[PDB]
């Protein structure tokens, strides 16, 4: 046991176990990935595309070998792509693809900011226009931000020193609306 | 090129004896079970039925993970996790206007082990009323993330802080927000 500095320097040990169902094109292609992680190092996995356990690191070697010898277990994981993955995708569709929330779009100076907030899902496209003409230069974005509550936001900036008479337009395309949203600003 | 990912993520942690069992759709929590509260909690009401169905045996799953941790700890010669301090950001739900009710979000990201103290400070005092918080959410690189929320009414006088404590931090992190 070692003593220095801040209170509670006691060692931690952490074990994580993850089952990841990866869906491609509805459910036509599905890949199960079962992972074991000790601290920060993943040590062993079952990749449904590989068909058996494989050690990632040394510490996982005993497990891959041991679990692969259970011909029974392999059979059940090999079938999990249906019994677990596809089956669970079935349930939901309040959580799955179906969910749709429309963005709140506003435009305000700061550099012009186009705020697109509160939308779902996260596929979106935000464009800038000056007097009908798209401006691609000087456009940066904070990125797509997940709020943790099943909505996203993003800020898309346009750098300009505005000139009087000019009309700037932010245009937003998202699945929740059939036609693009547009919001303008002038000085 | 994939479309969707469902993740069932569990953890167990020593010597804290904390642990979790949760589901996750494209990075968003469907529901969790904690070892600290032993409650099954759905993120939105729409997931209520699903969560009851899928969480009835979650405590056993965590007990299994605990037992596997002890085998792995032993096998690794008591190699301890390396603390990784969180990145913290504070932003609002929507663009801020005076007297327009809004929501402060504190994002605590890219950290391990999954142990943090997060408090909201209004004018340097801790806020107890109205605060919500997420449990520890999983990441591809096997670190964690967390969200804390505070519904609030913007003003020129009020000033906010998200205070975060973590063993990878030399001292508490203070992320400031104010109206400008």
């Amino acid at each position: 046991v070692l003593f220095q500095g801040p209170g509670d320097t006691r060692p931690r040990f952490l074990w994580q176990l993850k089952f990841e169902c990866h869906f491609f094109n509805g459910t036509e292609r599905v890949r199960l990935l079962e992972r074991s992680i000790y601290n920060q190092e993943e040590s062993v996995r079952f990749d449904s595309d590989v068909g058996e356990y494989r050690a990632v690191t040394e510490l996982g070697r005993p497990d891959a070998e041991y679990w692969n010898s259970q011909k029974d277990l392999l059979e059940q994981r090999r079938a999990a792509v249906d019994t677990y993955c596809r089956h669970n995708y079935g349930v939901g569709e309040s959580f799955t693809v179906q969910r749709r929330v429309e963005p709140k779009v506003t435009v305000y100076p700061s550099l012009l900011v186009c705020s697109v907030s509160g939308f779902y899902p996260g596929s979106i496209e935000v464009r800038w226009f000056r007097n009908g003409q798209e401006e691609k230069a000087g456009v940066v974005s904070t990125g797509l931000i997940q709020n943790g509550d099943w909505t996203f936001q993003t800020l898309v900036m346009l750098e300009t020193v505005p000139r009087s008479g000019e009309v700037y337009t932010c245009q937003v395309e998202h699945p929740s609306v059939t036609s693009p949203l547009t919001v303008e600003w002038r000085a | 090129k994939e479309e969707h990912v469902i993740i069932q993520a569990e953890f167990y942690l020593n010597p804290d004896q904390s642990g979790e069992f949760m589901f996750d759709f494209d990075g968003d929590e469907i529901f969790h079970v904690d070892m600290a509260k032993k409650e099954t909690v759905w993120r939105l009401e729409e997931f209520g039925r699903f969560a009851s169905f899928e969480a009835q045996g979650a405590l056993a799953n965590i007990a299994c993970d605990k037992a596997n941790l002890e085998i792995m700890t032993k096998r690794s010669n008591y190699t301890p996790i390396t603390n990784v301090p969180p990145e913290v950001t504070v932003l609002t739900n929507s663009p801020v206007e005076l007297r327009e009710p809004n929501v402060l979000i504190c994002f605590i990201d890219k950290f391990t082990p999954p142990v943090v103290n997060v408090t909201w400070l209004r004018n340097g005092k801790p806020v107890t009323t109205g605060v919500s918080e997420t449990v520890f959410l999983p990441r591809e690189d096997h670190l964690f993330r967390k969200f804390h929320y505070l519904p609030f009414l913007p003003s020129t006088e009020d000033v906010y802080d998200c205070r975060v404590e973590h063993w990878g931090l030399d001292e508490p992190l203070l992320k400031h927000w104010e109206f400008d």
Binding site: P62, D63, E65, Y66, W67, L73 | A60, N61, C64, A67, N68, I71, M72, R75
Partner: peptide, 7 residues
């Protein structure tokens, strides 16, 4: 069921 590590 519980998938237990090698002992």
């Amino acid at each position: 069921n519980c998938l237990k590590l090698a002992t």
